């Protein structure tokens, strides 16, 4: 049982540390290893024997452990080092990863583009109806997207999707879809998404009539 | 050396500390000529960022008390000329880890240099007997290095304990010193120094050479040395010591 | 240089067991240790490992029973094999190689290096299917000198992955390919979009290039204003 924080933040050029806590029988009587991984990429040894750094492994990377603690330091963070970051260390006879910290990487508020899409011709055709609205390129992760159909606000037909934090510019981008039977669909005139951000100082629909 | 104290200046004149280029010390060696140090060979194996295998390398340390004073009075840097890994060595098992390394220019020996003699081949060091590793290697499992080199008392296990201790994994060449209750033990960075044993007559000689274990200091787990008696005679036809 | 090459991705209905095989391209695993550790969405947990010359597995608790792990030196293959699968053993597989096993008084399962590219197994009685893929067109008021969004609704597909290219990887700045969404049928749906600019709608053509190998399905979609 090893904890880390969830989250940590910090701007580019900032010193972060991840914290990795355990117990007498994991950390208090071993030494800690830390991965990184980044999204849709194999994990990569950062730091072994509480402060070692394989080759390969960028110098900003460092590591330290005390009593039943450990800690990652990033110096001088960069956009790319958005990832999950993991301690491990054996416990009596077999091995453990920390719960991971997703490192978010501070950037000033960017408001979305928003546009909204009606099904296509070739979906109706096929049978179904799906509405997708697109949130472009925003900062912070945190945004709300409301459905609305003839002007009802909508409640349990829409799933959100949302990318990781982009490892240049530091935005996130978000889909959300509204899925309704063709039939369905066919009974109503406007369709609308209204989403409210930081960013926007008030909030911002996009809209269709079907037909 | 977990379990251990610090040495006290100039008592084990023969320990020298190798470093490794932008890593500092990596392994010890142990003076036997002022042209030739004995180490282990798995400190010489490459790997894939370093090239230890290559003496260019290397920088020697001796006469070093502290690794935080390496210009100290007394302290000799060397380059490496040579690296003369035992042909059998074994990458797997450890099986004869025994290495000379070369001096590029000779040792001046002083109160804080000075060569250990090695034992012949009939040597006996008996099971029981009281003898000294030393290194700047980790003080505590899980722990770090010591700045100042640190001495540690073992004890030598019969042969057949040892094999029963570390099933499968010993061979003749090697020996297990320590403690069943663990406690003192080599640990990290100690690999490749001098296992040092102080005779009834008060002579030094080295009995053997840091070479791996399970763990540190732990129960049942004392640590691994190549048997330097057995090498007598290689390390004459290799350096003329 | 070291490559741990693992066997394809499976789908597994609930109960059923996967053996999931890691091939050291080299064909030897030489001094080094092969260790298991699987990614689920949650984290990274270990497995366990084997020193294939010298082998006799380590197991983590959580799956002591259910895991096997097995390796050939002669054929530099490792195996892992988790049986009584469940749903929440959908997750990625890595097999990784470790440090020199005698080199680190420490020891080497905490020493993972050279990973394989992972291998998914889903644990679902869905049926392999490939996606219908819909053209998302750009909006009739994309504003004049700004910037238009358009995209590919990529739809009901079993298992994952499926991989998006615009303009057969021509097209790579602005597009965002979402994570998939699993459908309560079992069936998975994203969305693929690209911002262009506005000015580029009436010459440039868009196409999704849409490919779900697991049912060998291939599908170019033409995104037109119209
Ligand atoms: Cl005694
Ligand atoms: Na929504
Ligand atoms: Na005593
Ligand atoms: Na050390
Ligand atoms: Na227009
Ligand atoms: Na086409």
Not at chain 1, 99 to 113: F, H, I, N
């Amino acid at each position: 049982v090893l904890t880390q924080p969830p989250s940590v933040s910090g701007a580019p050029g900032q010193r972060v540390t991840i914290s990795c806590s355990g117990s007498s029988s994991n950390i208090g009587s071993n030494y800690v290893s830390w991965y990184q991984q980044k999204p849709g990429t194999a994990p990569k040894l950062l730091i072994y024997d509480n402060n070692q750094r394989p080759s390969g492994v960028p110098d900003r990377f460092s590591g330290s452990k005390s009593g039943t603690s450990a800690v990652l330091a990033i110096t001088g963070l960069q956009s790319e080092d958005e990832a999950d970051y993991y301690c491990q260390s054996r416990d009596i006879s077999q091995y453990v990863f920390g719960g991971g910290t997703k490192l978010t990487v501070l950037r000033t508020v960017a408001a979305p583009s928003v546009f909204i899409f009606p099904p296509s011709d070739e979906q109706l055709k096929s049978g179904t109806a799906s509405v997708v609205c697109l949130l472009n390129n925003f900062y912070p992760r945190e945004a709300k997207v409301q459905w609305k159909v003839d002007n009802a606000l909508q409640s349990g037909n829409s799933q959100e999707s949302v990318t990781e934090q982009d490892s240049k510019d530091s935005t996130y981008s978000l889909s959300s879809t509204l899925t309704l039977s063709k039939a369905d669909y066919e009974k109503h005139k406007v369709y609308a998404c209204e989403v409210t951000h930081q960013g926007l100082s008030s909030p911002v629909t996009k809209s269709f009539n079907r037909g | 050396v977990v379990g251990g104290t610090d040495a006290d200046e100039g008592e084990w004149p023969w320990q020298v500390s190798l470093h490794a280029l932008g890593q500092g010390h990596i392994c010890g060696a142990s003076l036997i000529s002022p042209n030739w140090l004995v180490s282990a060979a798995h400190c010489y194996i490459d790997d894939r960022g370093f090239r230890y295998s290559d003496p260019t390398q290397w920088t020697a340390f001796l006469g070093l008390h502290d690794q935080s004073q390496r210009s100290a009075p007394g302290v000799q840097e060397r380059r490496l000329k040579r690296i003369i890994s035992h042909p059998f060595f074994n990458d797997f098992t450890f099986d004869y880890d025994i290495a000379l390394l070369e001096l590029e220019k000779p040792a001046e020996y002083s109160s804080m240099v000075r060569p250990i003699s090695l034992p012949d081949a009939s040597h006996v060091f008996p099971a029981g007997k009281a003898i000294w590793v030393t290194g700047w290697g980790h003080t505590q499992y899980g722990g770090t290095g010591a700045l100042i080199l640190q001495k540690g008392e073992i004890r030598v296990i019969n042969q057949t304990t040892c094999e029963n201790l570390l099933p499968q994994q010993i061979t003749p060449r090697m020996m297990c010193v320590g403690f069943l209750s663990g406690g003192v033990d080599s640990c990290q960075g100690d690999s490749g120094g001098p296992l040092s044993s102080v005779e009834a007559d008060g002579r030094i000689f080295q009995a053997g050479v840091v070479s791996w274990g399970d763990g540190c200091a732990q129960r049942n787990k004392p640590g691994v040395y190549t048997r330097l008696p057995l090498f007598r005679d290689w390390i004459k036809e290799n350096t003329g010591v | 240089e070291v490559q741990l090459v693992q066997s394809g991705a499976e789908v597994k209905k609930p109960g059923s067991s996967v053996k999931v095989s890691c091939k050291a391209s080299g064909g030897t695993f030489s001094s080094y240790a092969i260790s298991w550790v699987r990614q689920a969405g949650q984290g990274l947990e270990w497995m366990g490992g084997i020193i294939p010359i010298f082998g006799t597995a380590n197991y983590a608790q959580k799956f002591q029973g259910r895991v096997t792990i097995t390796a050939d030196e002669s054929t530099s293959t490792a195996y892992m094999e988790l049986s009584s699968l469940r749903s929440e053993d959908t997750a990625v597989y890595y097999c990784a190689r470790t440090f020199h096993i005698r080199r680190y008084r420490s020891g080497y399962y905490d020493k993972m290096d050279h990973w394989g590219q992972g291998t998914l197994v889903t644990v679902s009685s869905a049926s392999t299917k490939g996606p219908s893929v819909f053209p998302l067109a750009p909006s009739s008021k994309s504003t004049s000198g700004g910037t238009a969004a358009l995209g590919c609704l990529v739809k009901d597909y079993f298992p994952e992955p499926v991989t998006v290219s615009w303009n057969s990887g021509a097209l790579t700045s602005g597009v965002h390919t979402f994570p998939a969404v699993l459908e309560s049928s079992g069936l998975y749906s994203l969305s693929s979009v690209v911002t262009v600019p506005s000015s580029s709608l009436g010459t440039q053509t868009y196409i999704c290039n849409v490919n779900h190998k697991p049912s060998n399905t291939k599908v170019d979609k033409k995104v037109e204003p119209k």
